[PDB]
Amino acid sequence: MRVGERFTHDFVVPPHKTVRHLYPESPEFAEFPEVFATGFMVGLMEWACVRAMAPYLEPGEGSLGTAICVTHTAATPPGLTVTVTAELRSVEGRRLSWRVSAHDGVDEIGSGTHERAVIHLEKFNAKVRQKTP
Amino acid sequence: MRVGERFTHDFVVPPHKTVRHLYPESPEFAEFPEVFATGFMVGLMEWACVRAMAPYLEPGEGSLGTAICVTHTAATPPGLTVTVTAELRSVEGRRLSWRVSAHDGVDEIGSGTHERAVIHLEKFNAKVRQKTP
Numbered sequence: 001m002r003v004g005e006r007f008t009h010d011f012v013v014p015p016h017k018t019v020r021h022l023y024p025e026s027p028e029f030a031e032f033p034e035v036f037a038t039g040f041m042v043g044l045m046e047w048a049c050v051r052a053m054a055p056y057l058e059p060g061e062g063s064l065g066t067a068i069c070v071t072h073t074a075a076t077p078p079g080l081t082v083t084v085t086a087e088l089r090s091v092e093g094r095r096l097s098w099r100v101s102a103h104d105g106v107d108e109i110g111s112g113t114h115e116r117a118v119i120h121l122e123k124f125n126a127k128v129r130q131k132t133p
Numbered sequence: 134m135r136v137g138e139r140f141t142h143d144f145v146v147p148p149h150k151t152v153r154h155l156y157p158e159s160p161e162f163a164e165f166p167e168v169f170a171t172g173f174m175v176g177l178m179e180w181a182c183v184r185a186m187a188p189y190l191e192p193g194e195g196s197l198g199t200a201i202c203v204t205h206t207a208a209t210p211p212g213l214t215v216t217v218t219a220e221l222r223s224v225e226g227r228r229l230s231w232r233v234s235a236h237d238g239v240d241e242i243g244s245g246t247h248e249r250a251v252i253h254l255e256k257f258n259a260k261v262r263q264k265t266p
Contacts, residue, residue, distance in 0.1 A: 026180055028187070029180065039175040065171045068201065070200065128168060131209075
């Protein structure tokens with residue numbers, strides 16, 4: 001896991017990763033064309049980076065996404081394979097950053113950056129509990 | 134539309150908007166803390182801007198998100214209300230650019246920018262259906 005190393009992750013888009021499935025609560029999204037939602041592309045890019053960094057975590061640790069800055073440049077219907085490529089840009093202590101890019105086999109669909117922070121899972125969950133109603 | 138006009142969108146986070154629910158097929162995400170996923174925060178920011186834009190589109194139009202560039206700085210358990218504030222920066226042809234931020238009643242959880250493109254829904258759906266395997 002050196003800076004400049006590339007990690008790849010492939011995912012066939014199923015029908016339930018389209019826009020209306022991200023927020024079934026949204027009448028505003030209900031009838032939208034059946035294309036892979038930006039929020040699901042983001043979650044796939046983050047999933048690629050989590051798989052790339054798993055060797056860096058010590059027992060008890062996990063990670064949070066702290067920033068996402070990407071374009072979404074072409075649309076993908078269900079059935080195509082989205083390949084995400086995660087290129088490690090920086091690792092320093094708790095902070096990691098990648099350049100991410102995604103292609104659906106037909107078009108480049110988007111690219112940009114993603115940053116993560118390593119967390120201590122138990123300490124983090126206790127903080128979460130204190131702001132839980 | 135009025136540049137500098139702020140729109141607010143409030144959303145109580147239900148249990149099914151945590152990280153594990155974004156990708157039930159990800160074993161990695163299945164063990165994550167039960168906090169609002171960045172992919173769901175991105176979709177909520179899109180939803181805010183879609184509601185702001187709606188009165189101003191013509192019949193048969195909608196929009197797509199073309200870029201998002203946000204931080205995600207604090208974590209939110211189910212049961213808090215996330216309020217997205219969306220402020221229009223510019224309208225150029227079919228392109229609309231926004232400043233977005235979100236807060237969960239306890240902490241600011243993220244901020245940055247978002248761009249959208251107005252589409253003709255039927256024309257775009259027919260073009261989508263043609264790259265479908």
